[PDB]
Amino acid sequence: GTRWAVLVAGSNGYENYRHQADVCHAYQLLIKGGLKEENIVVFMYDDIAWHELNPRPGVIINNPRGEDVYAGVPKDYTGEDVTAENLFAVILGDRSKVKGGSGKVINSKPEDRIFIFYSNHGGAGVLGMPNEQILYAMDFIDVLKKKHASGGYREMVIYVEACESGSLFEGIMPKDLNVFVTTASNAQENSWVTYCPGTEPSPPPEYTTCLGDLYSVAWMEDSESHNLRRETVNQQYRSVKERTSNFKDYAMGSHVMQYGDTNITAEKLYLFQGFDPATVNEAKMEVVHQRDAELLFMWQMYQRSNKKTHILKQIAETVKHRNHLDGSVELIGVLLYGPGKGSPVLQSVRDPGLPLVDNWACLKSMVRVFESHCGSLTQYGMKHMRAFANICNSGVSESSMEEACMVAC
Amino acid sequence: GTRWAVLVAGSNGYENYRHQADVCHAYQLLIKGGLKEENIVVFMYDDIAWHELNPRPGVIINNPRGEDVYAGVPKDYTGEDVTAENLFAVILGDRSKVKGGSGKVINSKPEDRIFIFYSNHGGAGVLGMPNEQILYAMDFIDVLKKKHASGGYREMVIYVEACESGSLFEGIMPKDLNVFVTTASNAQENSWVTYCPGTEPSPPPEYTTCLGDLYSVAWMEDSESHNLRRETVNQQYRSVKERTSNFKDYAMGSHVMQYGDTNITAEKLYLFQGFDPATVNEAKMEVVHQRDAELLFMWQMYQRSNKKTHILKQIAETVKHRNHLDGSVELIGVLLYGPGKGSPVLQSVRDPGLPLVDNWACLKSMVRVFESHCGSLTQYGMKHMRAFANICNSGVSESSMEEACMVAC
Ligand SMILES: *[C@@H]1O[C@H](CO)[C@@H](O)[C@H](O)[C@H]1NC(C)=O
Ligand SMILES: *[C@@H]1O[C@H](CO)[C@@H](O)[C@H](O)[C@H]1NC(C)=O
């Protein structure tokens, strides 16, 4: 059969360099293993390589050894074409449902295998897509069920790098889809960022933005340092789990989770990632929170400048925007449930194995009502997704949500 | 000698019923023990007994058994006269430095004893006074040193009911003043509120506001249930400590602390609180945070109404005001120290036994700069006092504080 891949960075902006850095590295890794470019679909906004802030124009690196991963990466879905609708259409393999981009899709055969890697921001039940778009977990599950029902592949492996990424599959990912999944974190942890300005191991001094993400570089640097005809999917999961746990210090690391068909863990990794003919034959990392890396970048910029006050006022606006969202959400909880019960309700985490939300259509509706009244969530606002899900689960009506949002905003 | 007392409620508003309820109960307790009215100075705003919301006009109660404590309480310093300046002047006993009120002061003799009880809101190093006034711990210490240096008393006992009230004395209260102090909480805990609408033990159903404060009713109900010619100061401290710890559950209770001259703990309580001739011869309480009781009261009102939306919009404004203060302070930390270090700096608590702040004049200056730019702190904003103290201790200049406050506000 034929090995296919879909690589997605869900973010843009130079502050988010790392997510397209991850995706570009994954592309070069798969090419080195003998996957063909026509079978690898790359979603990247593509604003990094030639960004005015990039100290190495035309180059993207993904770890402090500084090897370029940008050259040769195809422009399949870039800019405005990096959408959930295009991602869903690529996975289904129906070129007629794609809007824009190259038209490359996963029009795979029943004997083929597929490898999907996503890297950016997220929250409970949701994944980010560039310019304020949100991808809801259940729609992603639905695409996998549809693809499976059309006999489009033999097996699939999915790696997801994002905050709270366990919540995209817990209680909803079927095990009969020949799909195996791992996530950087459990349903409630955040995801961690590595190779940042000011940490060890040191990125090259000219960089003001972080180079990679902990779970992502963990699996990629593990793959490229091993013979993939011998390493199993399970061995990579084990190695990635230990490295991402960062010496089992969950204040500085997270729990890598697995979902779906665990029988796939017995398979050799080359069936999914190819094999590199040259591969024949640790310290605690200083990491930062995915949600904190943006401000660390603006602060790196502030400290290195002389317009110095323009950056500061932009830091002020960013924090103030976050405070507005955090407060609006907290106040909605107060108006709906009272003080002393609003935060318990909004912030309670369901037991592992249960779905985040019982009505996914309600979740989208609460987000819609919120944003109509309180403004756009942004990428940062996905941190409030569990709060909206908990409003849904509480049986509070959409009519009462409307009233609370109008009072709050 | 003669026994004197000063009783202070630092708050006003029907939401804060309990603080004047505490003070009124303490007054009746001391009269029953034979202290004379001319030797007891009462500071209470006096907006409770005849408040339009008071279901028992002319009556104040301090626990669910519903006995009035208001009748007979003198009007020494009420309304606009409840000030730190008047409190300091009362304690010093110089009637000429009082502004307004009755003119009653503690013009005590070297053989006299003094008992001081304060009950309301506070924060690190500060106590509230009605209508946005703040009383700074070191000014209170200075008054005690001045009073001591004039030979004004033999011994003094001080009870303080307020958030973070340990911080008013740690590292600054001398032990050579013949003054013994206990506080409802340590330097970082909040203070707890008892007998609230919706908790057990049940206040009479018509009340929408909490009746008392945990540490305050603990010492008063302990005094009135014992023979004070036999009970020692130490025994009351022990009993109050255990009751305020609420089964040693510090998520629902606090650590009562002691400062000053601990030799006074060996003395019989009647020397300070008098003795009642009739006294010849437990469940975990449901309590709420001092800072949370205001919103619980507005919510009780919301739930019992039909203007129903007027109250809600007032709840919204209260939460939004708090969010503005919390965000402004957090942003000032970000601008001064960077993200990832602003909160560690602003929220770090010094080791027990050290003073909250090294330059008390700087603390007042930071508050001044903040309020000029970001608006009044309010009573709620004393929760940010440790943040301002930590800015002072960090050596950040007043010039840099000004710049950060202008960017932030
Ligand atoms: C994995 O395959 C085994 C066959 O040995 C089967 O018993 C089991 O049900 C399968 N598990 C899943 C999750 O499909
Ligand atoms: C208490 O009095 C004793 C005398 O027995 C003395 O040793 C001690 O220093 C005194 N403590 C304080 C805090 O004044």
Q: Residues with Cβ < 8 Å from B348, sequence gap 6 or more? A: B390
Within 10 A of B83 (CB to CB), how many other CB atoms are there?
Answer: 20
Instruction: Quote the Cα angle for B399-B400-B403, to 5°.
Output: 95
Q: Same structural domain for residues B346 and B311? A: yes
Is A121 designated active site?
yes
User: Which amino acid belongs to residue A393?
Assistant: N
B299 vs A316, A339, A407: nearest CB: A339
CB A175 within 8 A of CB A148: no
Q: Same structural domain for residues A159 and A256? A: yes
* Domain final residue pick, B289, B324, B340: B289
Q: Is the peptide bond before A204 cis (omega within 30 degrees of 0)?
A: no
Q: Residues with Cβ < 8 Å from B1, sequence gap 6 or more? A: B109, B111, B112, B113, B154
Q: Which structure tokens are listed for A138?
A: 């259940």
Q: Which structure tokens are listed for B259?
A: 């400062």
Q: Same structural domain for residues A265 and A311? A: no
Q: Which of A24, A163, A210, A374 is catalytic?
A: A163
Q: Same structural domain for residues B341 and B403? A: yes
**Widest distance between CA atoms in chain A:** 65
CB B333 within 8 A of CB B343: yes
Q: Same structural domain for residues A193 and A332? A: no
Ligand 2 pocket residues where CB is under 6 Å: B 175, 261-263
CA distances (Å), origin A16, targets A210, A379, B114, B230: 8, 11, 64, 71
CB B381 within 8 A of CB B128: no
| Distance in angstroms (rounded) separating the CA atoms of residues A184 and A190 | 9
| Distance in angstroms (rounded) separating the CA atoms of residues A400 and A391 | 10
| Distance in angstroms (rounded) separating the CA atoms of residues A50 and A70 | 11
Nearest to B376 by CA among B367, B365, B366, B385: B367
Q: Residues with Cβ < 8 Å from B313, sequence gap 6 or more? A: A407
Ligand lying nearest the CA atom of residue A175: 1
Q: Same structural domain for residues B193 and B335? A: no
Instruction: Quote the Cα angle for B198-B203-B208, to 5°.
Output: 60
Q: In Å, what resolution does this model reach?
A: 2.0
| Distance in angstroms (rounded) separating the CA atoms of residues B368 and B390 | 15
CATH number, domain of B70, equals 3.40.50.1460
Partner B contacted by A407 (CB < 8 A): yes
Q: Same structural domain for residues B241 and B130? A: yes
Q: Which structure tokens are listed for A190?
A: 């955040």
The phi, psi pair for A289, rounded to 5°, reads -65, 140
Q: Which structure tokens are listed for A104?
A: 């490359």
Q: Same structural domain for residues B108 and B255? A: yes
Nearest to B118 by CA among B185, B173, B66: B185
The answer to the question of residue B373 being in a domain is: yes
- Structural domain count of chain A: 2
Within 10 A of B346 (CB to CB), how many other CB atoms are there?
Answer: 22
**Alpha helices, DSSP H only, in A53-169?**
84-92, 137-149
The answer to the question of residue B295 being in a domain is: no
Q: Same structural domain for residues A321 and A215? A: no
User: For ligand 1, what atom is nearest to the CA of residue A175?
Assistant: 13
A323 vs B299, B316, B327: nearest CB: B327
CATH number, domain of B321, equals 1.10.132.130
The HSE-up count of residue A338 (CA atoms within 13 Å, CB side) is 13
CB A158 within 8 A of CB A87: no
The phi, psi pair for A284, rounded to 5°, reads -70, 130
Q: Same structural domain for residues A281 and A360? A: no
User: Which amino acid belongs to residue B378?
Assistant: T
The chain A residue lying nearest B293, using CA atoms, is A339
CB B184 within 8 A of CB B256: yes
Partner A contacted by B288 (CB < 8 A): yes
Q: Same structural domain for residues B35 and B139? A: yes
The answer to the question of residue B108 being in a domain is: yes
CB B195 within 8 A of CB B248: no
Q: Could you tell me the residue range of the domain that residue B194 belongs to?
A: 3-289
Q: Using DSSP, state whether B114 is helix, strand or coil.
A: strand
CB B88 within 8 A of CB B143: yes
- A212-213 sheet: strands from edge to edge: A212-213, A192-194, A288-289
Q: Same structural domain for residues A182 and A240? A: yes
Ligand 1 pocket residues where CB is under 6 Å: A 175, 261-263
Q: Residue A127: enclosing H or E segment and its boundaries?
A: strand A126-129
Q: Which structure tokens are listed for B121?
A: 């809101």
Residue in B323, B332, B405 to test binding to A, most A beta-carbons within 10 Å: B323
CB A329 within 8 A of CB A346: yes
DSSP E strands, B67-145: 113-119, 122-123, 126-129, 133-136
| Distance in angstroms (rounded) separating the CA atoms of residues B333 and A12 | 28
The answer to the question of residue B369 being in a domain is: yes
The answer to the question of residue A297 being in a domain is: no
Quote the radius of gyration of chain A (alpha carbons, Å).
21
Q: How far is CA A370 from the centre of its chain?
A: 23
Partner B contacted by A409 (CB < 8 A): no
| Distance in angstroms (rounded) separating the CA atoms of residues B207 and B111 | 44
Q: Residues with Cβ < 8 Å from A98, sequence gap 6 or more? A: A86, A89, A90, A105
Using most ligand atoms within 8 A of CB, pick from B155, B181, B261, B263 the residue to mutate for ligand 2: B263
| Distance in angstroms (rounded) separating the CA atoms of residues A348 and B249 | 21
Residues 337-366 of A with CB under 8 A from B: 338-340
The length of chain B, given as a count of residues = 409
Say yes or no for a CB contact (<8 Å) between B331 and A316: yes
| Distance in angstroms (rounded) separating the CA atoms of residues B375 and B408 | 12
Report how far ligand 1's centroid is from the alpha carbon of A116 (Å).
Answer: 22
Q: How far is CA B163 from the centre of its chain?
A: 7
* Domain final residue pick, A240, A256, A289: A289
The answer to the question of residue B320 being in a domain is: yes
Report how far ligand 1's centroid is from the alpha carbon of A178 (Å).
Answer: 11
CB A373 within 8 A of CB A305: no
* Domain final residue pick, B233, B257, B289: B289
The answer to the question of residue A300 being in a domain is: no
Match 């007629």 to its residue by tokens: A96
The answer to the question of residue A294 being in a domain is: no
